[PDB]
Enzyme design. Structure first.
Site, PDB file in Angstrom:
ATOM      1  N   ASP A   2       0.930  -1.148   0.054  1.00 51.04           N
ATOM      2  CA  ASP A   2       0.108  -0.063  -0.125  1.00 51.04           C
ATOM      3  C   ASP A   2       1.019   1.122  -0.104  1.00 51.04           C
ATOM      4  O   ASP A   2       2.193   1.180   0.288  1.00 51.04           O
ATOM      5  CB  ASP A   2      -0.813  -0.025   1.312  1.00 51.04           C
ATOM      6  CG  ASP A   2      -1.955  -0.876   1.346  1.00 51.04           C
ATOM      7  OD1 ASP A   2      -2.774  -0.756   0.232  1.00 51.04           O
ATOM      8  OD2 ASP A   2      -2.152  -1.590   2.345  1.00 51.04           O
ATOM      9  N   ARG A  19       1.279  16.933  -4.266  1.00 52.87           N
ATOM     10  CA  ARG A  19      -0.131  16.678  -4.549  1.00 52.87           C
ATOM     11  C   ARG A  19      -0.899  18.122  -4.484  1.00 52.87           C
ATOM     12  O   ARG A  19      -0.631  19.077  -3.553  1.00 52.87           O
ATOM     13  CB  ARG A  19      -0.895  16.022  -3.158  1.00 52.87           C
ATOM     14  CG  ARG A  19      -2.249  15.718  -3.428  1.00 52.87           C
ATOM     15  CD  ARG A  19      -2.736  14.946  -2.284  1.00 52.87           C
ATOM     16  NE  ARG A  19      -4.338  15.255  -2.132  1.00 52.87           N
ATOM     17  CZ  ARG A  19      -5.068  14.785  -1.154  1.00 52.87           C
ATOM     18  NH1 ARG A  19      -4.810  13.923  -0.357  1.00 52.87           N
ATOM     19  NH2 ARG A  19      -6.431  14.957  -1.329  1.00 52.87           N
ATOM     20  N   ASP A  70      -4.912  -3.631   5.895  1.00 57.07           N
ATOM     21  CA  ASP A  70      -5.238  -3.144   7.216  1.00 57.07           C
ATOM     22  C   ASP A  70      -6.590  -3.434   7.671  1.00 57.07           C
ATOM     23  O   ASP A  70      -7.085  -3.787   8.921  1.00 57.07           O
ATOM     24  CB  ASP A  70      -4.705  -1.894   7.551  1.00 57.07           C
ATOM     25  CG  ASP A  70      -4.932  -0.602   6.490  1.00 57.07           C
ATOM     26  OD1 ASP A  70      -5.706  -1.237   5.584  1.00 57.07           O
ATOM     27  OD2 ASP A  70      -4.686   0.526   6.431  1.00 57.07           O
ATOM     28  N   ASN A 108     -11.656  -5.153   4.981  1.00 53.77           N
ATOM     29  CA  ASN A 108     -12.053  -5.284   3.647  1.00 53.77           C
ATOM     30  C   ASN A 108     -10.680  -5.968   2.783  1.00 53.77           C
ATOM     31  O   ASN A 108     -10.883  -6.230   1.548  1.00 53.77           O
ATOM     32  CB  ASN A 108     -12.509  -4.054   2.838  1.00 53.77           C
ATOM     33  CG  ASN A 108     -11.570  -2.843   3.517  1.00 53.77           C
ATOM     34  OD1 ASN A 108     -10.664  -2.944   3.674  1.00 53.77           O
ATOM     35  ND2 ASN A 108     -12.275  -1.640   3.444  1.00 53.77           N
ATOM     36  N   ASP A 109      -9.652  -5.798   3.655  1.00 57.16           N
ATOM     37  CA  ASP A 109      -8.412  -6.157   3.008  1.00 57.16           C
ATOM     38  C   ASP A 109      -8.150  -7.783   3.273  1.00 57.16           C
ATOM     39  O   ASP A 109      -7.263  -8.392   2.774  1.00 57.16           O
ATOM     40  CB  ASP A 109      -7.256  -5.563   3.508  1.00 57.16           C
ATOM     41  CG  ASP A 109      -6.962  -4.343   3.045  1.00 57.16           C
ATOM     42  OD1 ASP A 109      -7.593  -3.749   2.063  1.00 57.16           O
ATOM     43  OD2 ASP A 109      -6.795  -3.158   3.855  1.00 57.16           O
ATOM     44  N   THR A 113      21.928 -36.833  20.293  1.00 57.41           N
ATOM     45  CA  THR A 113      23.501 -36.858  19.919  1.00 57.41           C
ATOM     46  C   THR A 113      23.392 -36.101  18.554  1.00 57.41           C
ATOM     47  O   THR A 113      24.555 -35.704  17.948  1.00 57.41           O
ATOM     48  CB  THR A 113      24.069 -37.944  19.905  1.00 57.41           C
ATOM     49  OG1 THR A 113      23.981 -38.926  19.027  1.00 57.41           O
ATOM     50  CG2 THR A 113      24.301 -38.538  21.237  1.00 57.41           C
ATOM     51  N   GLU A 150      29.118 -39.272  12.697  1.00 54.75           N
ATOM     52  CA  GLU A 150      27.922 -38.258  12.872  1.00 54.75           C
ATOM     53  C   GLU A 150      28.554 -36.655  12.943  1.00 54.75           C
ATOM     54  O   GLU A 150      28.037 -35.845  12.669  1.00 54.75           O
ATOM     55  CB  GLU A 150      26.866 -38.323  13.660  1.00 54.75           C
ATOM     56  CG  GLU A 150      25.880 -39.721  13.264  1.00 54.75           C
ATOM     57  CD  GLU A 150      25.909 -39.144  11.611  1.00 54.75           C
ATOM     58  OE1 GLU A 150      25.370 -38.326  11.131  1.00 54.75           O
ATOM     59  OE2 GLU A 150      26.362 -40.120  10.726  1.00 54.75           O
TER      60      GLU A 150
HETATM   61 MG   LIG Z   1      -7.448  -0.550   3.765  1.00 57.51          MG
END
Ligand SMILES: [Mg+2]
Ligand SMILES: C/C=C(/C)C(=O)O[C@@H]1C[C@H]2[C@@H]([C@H]1C)[C@@H]1OC(=O)[C@@](C)(O)[C@@]1(O)[C@@H](OC(=O)CCC)C[C@]2(C)OC(C)=O
Ligand code: NA
EC number: 7.2.2.10
Length: 994
Positions: free
Chosen positions: A351, A560, A703, A706-707, A799, A908
């Site tokens: 996101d 923006r 989050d 709906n996700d 062992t 071993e």
């Molecule tokens: Mg969301």
């Protein structure tokens, strides 16, 4: 039930045939409840304690052991009496490993949590309705509320069903549906219908969603959908219809089991054929019953030798460690088994706002018109300083400081900012920082105001708590905010109606201040304001404004843009319907452009580097935002998803362009796209399916509730540590700091974990191969049991577990993040590697059997059988005359066994050193590289001496310490192992495919 968001106020009351004043009648309620059912989300997985434990005994390898623990329990019981009190020790230890192991499975699960159960909480216990039998409102259980009946809700109340609002009782109704739409602020609801039959929930302004809160107000409404038909019940249906595959390793484990099953049964057919001469023996011979006990008793040795019993322990303690190791880097991994399917991620959809950027807005540039003479035009661009919400910074016109008052254009731009804004600031003492109160891009505007006090009002003579809303409240006292036309995505803007304050501001009093997206409001501008004066918007002035808006929002600034304007002569107050946003775009017209404000959401710094590492690690990163496609793209170029000059025509789509595509090109866009403009939940889930059709391992962030369906569908859903708790429970991991760079720090540990975890698995698996070769030689020949089940367990659990868990602490390769993502179809052992363990095993199988048969024959102190049949130990007590001059009980001697057990235990520790690297020689990569390894080898050896020299131990394992010469025999047999493998590594490196 029905798509009520579009019908109306009556078309809904009619549809159900219910009165807004009476409600549903007792008879209606009965029929509706029968047709729609109760208002609930379906029941749960009635997984019982009995089925949970049965699930435990369904694995192939766990069953195979359970059968053996039985065969072994029958032997170590009846047939075999006196002369041994240890009988049952073998069946008892195997049962512990099982029953005890099943506890893990049942506890692990009981502490697990269902994402679908997390929703159940978003359901009010009760609700308030108006039935046709009481005028008073009744308060029944939300469970009995039905589609069609009249419901009443007020502040605090959590919406009981999906309701269509009939009429708002209060002055204003505010709802908080952040969890179901992601909207941060409480939104405003209305009663007028929404025309679109396919509207997204963010635009159903006339609907209350079951699960959200009433922030402010009271209102009445008719219930549209109930239970599973609500926007939340529809999410429960997707998360339930969804199916979780299983970490590739868990797949390779079901595969190994099926195989380790076929091989076992073959080994018996083989062993049976190797001893086929028995069908050419005396019918009266005898020992018939002893022979069956030999084969039945070697069957248990075969099973506890083939299965790697300590592994489940070594893997989960390696993951649990890493878990804690990641948690120190803000990566809270929930599901452990999921740490593998992370190192393999090839695509990461993040996101933007919270994770890629800071979400800490601030205005950097402003600009107002300065002159408009015909075709000539001059703007007045400013620069502002300060990244915090802190009222500390200066406005610099041309790099040079300025006093905002000196510009009239800047006096208005400053009011439109403080008046058309529902958000403010707040200074706290706790952390001594200025804290955004309302919204991020609004609080950034009140902050802009404080930094350019147009009135030059004194302020350095004030505290810090107050300094917060100083210049803003002075503008709040100059204009009286009548009402406000809220933001709506239709017109993409908002406004406020403001009349003056006293006669000191009487002149052309009533004004309307509007702020919104530039394309939007600029189309509605009939005039521009140059100072205190005004002109008509003209072609040239408009293109000069839109260009600067493009550079700012598409240029390296990626700002923006907000356009601020005013409606000089607004409509008469009485001529306005302040309760139907549809008409709101009509009132915000015939505007005069005032200026635009360009702000910035700084991208988290470490993000720019994280994107780069993914480029190297070969992982594709997809940005999912809301920004128009123009700046969404620009942001990609700024962080690295796209090249400054790189073409992006076919690698960046918008939610709309994507939908308009036919299923073919849609699926093709997903294999190249790297940025999705405006998408909703629908989209997040489709892109996962397409990314999955190309057999890709994808990570997805979310989050909201709906996700949830999308986080569940992606291979690894990454919930935000600040997001809802339903999202967290549907996710494999949670970013404590919502930082994208945290995901990449987690994709790296996953690769590191799996590389190490890959070694210790091959290790433990190879030693099991050797123990099987042994048991197979012991029986093919007829020789006496070299190794006992009880001993093998000790080794596979303790062992070997120690050198095994220490291999998990190997040094991570330095190029881990320079190689592409691992393929999930990559097998753990194949090709040349299959051949080395094929040879190393064949070696230890020989070393163990041999070292035991040695103490028998060419033994400085023991019986002796140069070349004759020591193998016919079965038939002696009665055949003493025939080649058998001695005691027929030496064949149960402890010396031979501890001989072969010491050659295994040491072969071993050798093999644990050959395991520090797949093809690197030990000279080139020394054991001291990993200290934990050497230190565990000592603990193993001493732990081995324990069960030799103690008292109850040597007795229950049937081991008697061996002298210093017999120990040197163990070394001369074992140690050469480090050579056979060093030689095999040299092969792989040199002569071979690199
Ligand atoms: Mg969301
Ligand atoms: C184990 C003891 C015995 C006697 C035995 O029989 O092991 C067999 C042989 C083979 C088989 C495993 C069934 C196994 O099955 C698969 O799925 C393969 C194709 O991947 C596989 O081929 C490898 O093991 C793995 O990858 C395991 C991955 C967890 C190699 C292995 C084990 O042989 C060798 C030499 O290691
Ligand atoms: Na998932």
């Amino acid at each position: 039930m029905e798509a009520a968001h579009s019908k109306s106020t009556e078309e809904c009351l009619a549809y159900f045939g219910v009165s807004e004043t009476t409600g549903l009648t007792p008879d209606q309620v009965k029929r509706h409840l029968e047709k729609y059912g109760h208002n609930e989300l379906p029941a749960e997985e009635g997984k019982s304690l009995w089925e949970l434990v049965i699930e435990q005994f369904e694995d192939l390898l766990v069953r195979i052991l359970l059968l053996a623990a039985c065969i072994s329990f029958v032997l170590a019981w009846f047939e075999e009496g006196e002369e041994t009190i240890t009988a049952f020790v073998e069946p008892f230890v195997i049962l512990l490993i099982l029953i005890a192991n099943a506890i893990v499975g049942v506890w692990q699960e009981r502490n697990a949590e269902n994402a679908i159960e997390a929703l159940k909480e978003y359901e009010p216990e009760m609700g308030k309705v108006y039935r046709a039998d009481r005028k008073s409102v009744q308060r029944i259980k939300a469970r009995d509320i039905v589609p069609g009946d009249i419901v009443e809700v007020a502040v605090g109340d959590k919406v009981p069903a999906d309701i269509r609002i009939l009429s708002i009782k209060s002055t204003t109704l505010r709802v908080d549906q952040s969890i179901l739409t992601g909207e941060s602020v409480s939104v405003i609801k209305h009663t007028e219908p929404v025309p679109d039959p396919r509207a997204v929930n963010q635009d159903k302004k006339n609907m209350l969603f079951s699960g959200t809160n009433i922030a402010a107000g009271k209102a009445l409404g008719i219930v549209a959908t109930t239970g599973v038909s609500t926007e939340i019940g529809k999410i429960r249906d997707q998360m339930a219809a969804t199916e979780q595959d299983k970490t590739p390793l868990q797949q390779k484990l079901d595969e190994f089991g099926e195989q380790l099953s076929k091989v076992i049964s073959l080994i018996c057919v083989a062993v049976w054929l190797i001893n086929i001469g028995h069908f050419n023996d005396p019918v009266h011979g005898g020992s018939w019953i002893r022979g069956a006990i030999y084969y039945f008793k070697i069957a248990v040795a075969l099973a506890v030798a083939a299965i790697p019993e300590g592994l489940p322990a070594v893997i989960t303690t390696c993951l649990a460690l890493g878990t804690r190791r990641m948690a120190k880097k803000n990566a809270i991994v929930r599901s452990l088994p999921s740490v593998e399917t992370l190192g393999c991620t090839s695509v990461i959809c993040s996101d933007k706002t919270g994770t890629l950027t800071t979400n800490q807005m601030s205005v950097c540039k402003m600009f107002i018109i300065d002159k408009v003479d015909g075709d000539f035009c001059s703007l007045n661009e400013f620069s502002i300083t300060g990244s915090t919400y802190a009222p500390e910074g200066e406005v610099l016109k041309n790099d040079k400081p300025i006093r905002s008052g000196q510009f009239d254009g800047l006096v208005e731009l400053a009011t439109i900012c403080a008046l058309c804004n529902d958000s403010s600031l707040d200074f706290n003492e706790t952390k001594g920082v200025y804290e955004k109160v309302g919204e991020a891009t609004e609080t950034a505007l009140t902050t802009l105001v404080e930094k350019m006090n147009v009135f030059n009002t004194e302020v350095r003579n004030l505290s810090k708590v107050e300094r917060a809303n100083a210049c803003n409240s002075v503008i709040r006292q100059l204009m009286k905010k009548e009402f406000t036309l809220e933001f709506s995505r239709d017109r993409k803007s908002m406004s406020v109606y403001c009349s003056p304050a006293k006669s000191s501001r009487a002149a052309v009093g009533n004004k309307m201040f509007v702020k919104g997206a530039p394309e939007g409001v600029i189309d509605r501008c009939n005039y521009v304001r140059v100072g205190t004066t005004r002109v008509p918007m003209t072609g040239p002035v408009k293109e000069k404004i839109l260009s600067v808006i493009k550079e700012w929002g598409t240029g390296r600034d990626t700002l923006r843009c907000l356009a601020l304007a005013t409606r000089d002569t607004p409509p008469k107050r009485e001529e306005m319907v302040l309760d139907d946003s549809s008409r709101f775009m009509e009132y915000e017209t015939d505007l005069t452009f005032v200026g635009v404000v360009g702000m910035l959401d700084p991208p988290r710094k470490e993000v720019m580097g994280s994107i780069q590492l993914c480029r190297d690690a070969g992982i594709r990163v997809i940005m999912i935002t809301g920004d128009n496609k123009g700046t969404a793209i620009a942001i990609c170029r700024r962080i690295g998803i796209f090249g400054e000059n790189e073409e992006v025509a076919d690698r960046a789509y918008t939610g709309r362009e994507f939908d308009d595509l036919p299923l073919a090109e849609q699926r093709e866009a997903c294999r190249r796209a790297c940025c999705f403009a405006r998408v909703e939940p629908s989209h997040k889930s489709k892109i996962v399916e397409y990314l999955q059709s190309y057999d890709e391992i994808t990570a997805m962030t979310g989050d909201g509730v709906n996700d949830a369906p999308a986080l569940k569908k992606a291979e690894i859903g990454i919930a935000m540590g600040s997001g809802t708790a339903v999202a967290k429970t549907a996710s494999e991991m949670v970013l404590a700091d919502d930082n994208f760079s945290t995901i990449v720090a987690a994709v790296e540990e996953g690769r590191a974990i799996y590389n190490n975890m890959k070694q210790f698995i091959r290790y433990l698996i190879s030693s099991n191969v050797g123990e099987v070769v042994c048991i197979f030689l012991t029986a093919a020949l007829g020789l006496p049991e070299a190794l006992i089940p009880v001993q093998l367990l000790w080794v596979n659990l303790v062992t070997d577990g120690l050198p095994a868990t220490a291999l998990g602490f190997n040094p991570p390769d330095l190029d881990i993040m320079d190689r592409p993502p691992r393929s999930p179809k990559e097998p753990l052992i194949s090709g040349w590697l299959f051949f080395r363990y094929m040879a190393i095993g064949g070696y230890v199988g020989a070393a163990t059997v041999g070292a035991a048969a040695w103490w028998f024959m060419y033994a400085e102190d023991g019986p002796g059988v140069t070349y004759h049949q020591l193998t016919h130990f079965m038939q002696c007590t009665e055949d003493h005359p025939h080649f058998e001059g001695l005691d027929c009980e030496i064949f149960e001697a402890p010396e031979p066994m501890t001989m072969a057990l010491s050659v295994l235990v040491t072969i071993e520790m050798c093999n644990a050193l050959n395991s520090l690297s797949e093809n690197q020689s030990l000279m080139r990569m020394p054991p001291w590289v990993n200290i934990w390894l050497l230190g565990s080898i000592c603990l193993s050896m001493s732990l081995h001496f324990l069960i030799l020299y103690v008292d109850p131990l040597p007795m229950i394992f049937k081991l008697k310490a061996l002298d210093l010469t017999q120990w040197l025999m163990v070394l001369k047999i074992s140690l050469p192992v480090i050579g056979l493998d060093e030689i095999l590594k040299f092969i792989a490196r040199n002569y071979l495919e690199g």
